[PDB]
Design a protein around this nucleic acid. Structure first.
Lengths: 51, 49, 115
RNA sequence: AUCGAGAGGA
């Protein structure tokens, strides 16, 4: 499950760049690794890298 | 002597010069009250301080 | 920040009455005089002068709160007298005494200055 | 603004 934005609010800081919650960064890491893994399935790959 | 009435005070009073210090803690830097002001983003409860 | 102006202790606020008179219902012939913007000076002199009156049964004053500027004077007299009359007569007596004192001080100052 | 740190108050 991905919590909504109110659980991990992104705040517009003094610098116009938006600030992301810790949960958001962790979810970004999770999405990155999940996408890379899913890529390594649709096209076969060695069991070592998959593990 | 009592200032309000000018009568002598029955007991005699210890009085003399003593070095006193004024500390940085002043009431006007501490007095605080709130009625529905700003709230925190994550939880919607009143801010701190 | 919350400091009152210094003049608040002796200047009457708009609509404020200098003196108010109420009846003390506990006992007969007793009145409470509430005076605004006065302190121990007038209260004490008036109370002592009232105590000098043989027809006054009770005379007292108090400042309800030092941060406020009100004095309450309670006077009880004999049924043949009135607290209002006692108050007026006490003020008149104090004024007479002060006038005599001023005259005699003037005379004494002149005497001392000449020699 | 957030986080942390420090110094303080009762």
């Amino acid at each position: 499950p991905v919590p909504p934005l109110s659980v991990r609010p992104a705040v517009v800081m003094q610098g116009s760049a938006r600030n992301q919650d810790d949960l958001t960064h962790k979810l970004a890491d999770i999405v990155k690794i999940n996408n890379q893994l899913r890529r390594n399935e649709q096209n076969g790959a060695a069991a070592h890298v998959i593990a | 002597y009592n200032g309000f009435t000018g009568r002598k005070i029955t007991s005699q009073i210890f009085i003399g010069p003593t070095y006193y210090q004024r500390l940085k803690h002043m009431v006007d830097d501490k007095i605080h009250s709130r009625a529905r002001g700003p709230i925190q983003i994550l939880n919607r409860q009143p801010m701190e301080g | 920040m919350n400091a009152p102006p210094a003049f608040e202790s002796f200047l009457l606020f708009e609509g404020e009455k200098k003196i108010t008179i109420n009846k003390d219902t506990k006992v007969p012939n007793a009145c409470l005089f509430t005076i605004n913007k006065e302190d121990h000076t007038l209260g004490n002199i008036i109370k002592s002068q009232l105590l000098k009156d043989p027809q006054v049964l009770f005379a007292g004053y108090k400042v309800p709160h030092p941060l406020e500027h009100k004095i309450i004077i309670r006077v009880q007299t004999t049924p043949d007298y009135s607290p209002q009359e006692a108050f007026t007569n006490a003020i008149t007596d104090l004024i007479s005494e002060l006038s005599l004192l001023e005259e005699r001080f003037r005379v004494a100052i002149k005497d001392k200055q000449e020699g």
